[PDB]
Symmetry: C4
Subunit: 282 residues, 4 copies
């Protein structure tokens, strides 16, 4: 079983555990549940105002006396500010509730808009991760590599990548634990990420995987977490993306196929159909 899923999420059951986190819940529920909650409060509030009008008496013009239906639809036309003009308030109290209901309708619109903006304005990075890593010689050193691709034409500014090894380790007190190792990279910051980025960890005598083999990486249940962050121009907003690799997904001796090609016209070109293609000696 893999501790980390391919999407970079955790695979641990949270056994540890309706308005204790209401703001978080309103932003994280599905859209149909969200729209349903908004609708319920919308209807519930009008029903409450309908009861308020009736409690005052027959204070709605052209309304059947004691009718909740008529009072409710008058509440709707008031809170929403439709104000057709057939059902209208009679007397100071009805007109005072109307003054209140209008305020309530504006406040509710502001709240609903605030929540919708927070849910909408959560963009995706649009970044593709290579399905595998490779370990192969680069500049005379065995180098762990993966690569990323921008799926959009807009560029990503101040793009950072973090490659973390997660493996079970034993302390000199005999304590066995999962340790996280930030892997030194040749380039961790790309000021402008536009097309493709080959992320590289030279396995030098300081690397946590120096001397390791495919087999020793399994025995430590070694996994590799990748985090990408950057400022996306399409959104003028920060974005991120995560991914995880198991030891099984390292191609020892592999080489990523070049995704940059030259056309017959001589134009430089990016072919992302080879993004997952790895070359290997047989």
């Amino acid at each position: 079983p893999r501790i980390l899923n391919s999407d970079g999420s955790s695979n641990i059951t949270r056994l540890g555990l309706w308005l204790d986190d209401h703001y978080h819940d309103l932003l994280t529920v599905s859209w149909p549940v969200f729209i349903t909650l908004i609708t319920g409060l919308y209807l519930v509030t009008n029903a409450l105002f309908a009861l308020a009008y009736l409690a005052s008496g027959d204070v709605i013009e052209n309304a059947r006396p004691g009718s909740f239906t008529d009072a409710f639809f008058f509440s709707v036309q008031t809170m929403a500010t439709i104000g057709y003009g057939k059902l209208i308030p009679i007397g100071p109290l009805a007109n005072t509730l109307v003054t209140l209901e209008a305020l309530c309708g504006m406040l509710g619109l502001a709240v609903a808009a605030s929540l919708i903006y927070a849910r909408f304005t959560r963009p995706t990075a649009g970044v593709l991760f290579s399905s595998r890593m490779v370990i192969s010689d680069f500049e005379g050193k065995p180098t762990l590599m993966m690569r990323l691709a921008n799926l959009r034409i807009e560029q990503i500014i101040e793009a950072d990548v973090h490659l973390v090894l997660v493996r079970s380790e034993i302390s000199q007190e005999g304590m066995v634990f999962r340790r996280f190792h930030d892997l030194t990279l040749t380039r961790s910051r790309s000021p402008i990420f536009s097309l493709s980025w080959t992320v590289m960890h030279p396995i030098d005598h300081h690397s946590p995987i120096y001397g390791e083999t495919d087999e020793t990486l399994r025995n430590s249940h070694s996994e590799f977490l990748v985090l990408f962050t950057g400022h996306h121009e399409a959104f003028a907003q920060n974005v991120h993306a995560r991914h995880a690799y198991s030891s099984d997904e390292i191609i020892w001796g592999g080489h990523f196929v070049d995704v940059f090609t030259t056309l017959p016209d001589g134009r430089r070109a990016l072919d992302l159909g080879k993004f997952h293609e790895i070359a290997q000696h047989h």
Copy 2:
């Protein structure tokens, strides 16, 4: 008396000291006070428009002449744009005030929405702090430790922790002062914080608490401030959380109980009922 409270706030009386900071005050007052302020301005503005209409004359259809009540409710139905159709403006001046009032109503809605969004969209980190710290051997060194837990299923990106010692010190000029010491950590940046994080300060010969005891930490009135920051996925927004520990709350020789367990099914599992459990030799 503790200079810092458990929540990381200061315990100093600010003896040093209604529109001098109005924007800050509108975002920091309680919600009932905020709603009351919005309501007051709402009613006050309509009253001002009611006086404006009356000052022009009897320019409201179906309104009792000289009646503020009728003019006020006509202002309400105009600013809120209900426009039932019984009370309507008569003449160019009343219609000009209506044109103005509608603008005022839109501007006021935009302002109210701006303030509501700023007050709403202030999420909490959802991070739990261990009730105590511990000092115990890790990797052959006495190590000060505390730990954090994510109370939500959504992950926190680029999570930083800062462990600061605050203690009374004396300069070589004889000046006694409170100094803040950033404590070097084994891991200060966790690219993805999902479940639990054990924060560690190896007390090596460079540590400000190297050689200190429980007693010497009291005599210096030593306290420990913790700051957590990160980008929460649930909100696509930055969050933070703070906490403070006294010397009394360091368990010398303690060991945090492991919150990660394996179920009979073999699934890895997180039990946060042991988050505050510390093991100690007796």
Copy 3:
């Protein structure tokens, strides 16, 4: 003449130089000019719709034929969605313009709200700068110092300070220029800034002002720029503040008076009436 003003702004005349920067201009003009611009477009757009209705003919119920006044106020009641019900559209064209005008009114509300939110949500740091700097011995080294104070009860997270020397220098090619020197600080990052912060630059043999005197600092026209940045809890938003000091404003041998006092009750207390008080030997 001082190149930098006390507020950290530049004192250089920009001799180098209406819709070339319209978005910037809408956020930077004063509020009365902004409200005036919004009003003008509001009235101008209704006038344009009034002409559109008249161009179709007498298509407004209860409107005097050919009257711009009546058509204009009907546009107002339509765009603002008041819809009293006396002036109403006649025929498909008038009703089509109404369908368009309503859309225009919603789009204009969204635009106006977007601009208002951007102008409103620009908080101030609430940070006070000491009126002077001091140079005095701290930990056995002459140390340039200034200090900051939080004027609010809410804390500022991840607070950074940058102390820059600006002075006229000569290159070994003989070129005279203004150079900026980032001055090393004992603490440049305070994870939680709550009350007061004494910023310190030890003048060691690496300091750009090592060996300088009050007189040599004048001859180089030396100035000191201060930048403060942090995440304010009151706003859950980043804030900043700037300030500048001339050489005249350095008190050689000065010592800032302690703003932390103990009350008769024994409570620790912050007295900001001594924030600008400096002690000097005579």
Copy 4:
């Protein structure tokens, strides 16, 4: 052919490749296409409600039976909340659809406002790049230089610049590739960028262009990418700007003309008409 355009964008044809990225597309399409899309959905939704009302029967007051036109305009006056009062719902079903349509109108306004705010609030840095670079002696070292200018009076806080060399290189395994070199700068962070900034890369024995000539830079197809980032005070928001230079655009032996002048009055002054002027020995 230049791999990077002067604006810092990539010049590679993306051969690699309507609701697969709908949120990105709504923010990136032109404004006329955006307004057209909003209009279409606006009209389409009203048409759907018109059909709903007719499907119930003749439930609209003063409406011609079976007329889509009349039902459609009644939908408009309901969703937009105009509510003139001539066309009004008859019976519980029509009034229930009205209750729904009003909600739909509010939700659609919130969505439209959210998208408009995201598209509007994407400010430009207002930063000018010198049309050329220069290599000339500074402080006794040949130094690559370009410079930036603030086109606005508002200052930019925590301004960063990154100067990257891009050139074709060969690995010791014989692999030819484009490598990116972060060029060390004398100043990469200017805490307050107000007027002009001369960015400098001393070509010391560690520089990737140490020993290179104008000719060798061509043979490697060397290009220089510039990224500027900062917090603009006019917007209280982060901004950025990018630019690219070819080897052809380096003036060997050049010196940027000083843009700072003193007036007859003695006031320091900034003349940006000389921003692109370079002095060269002939």
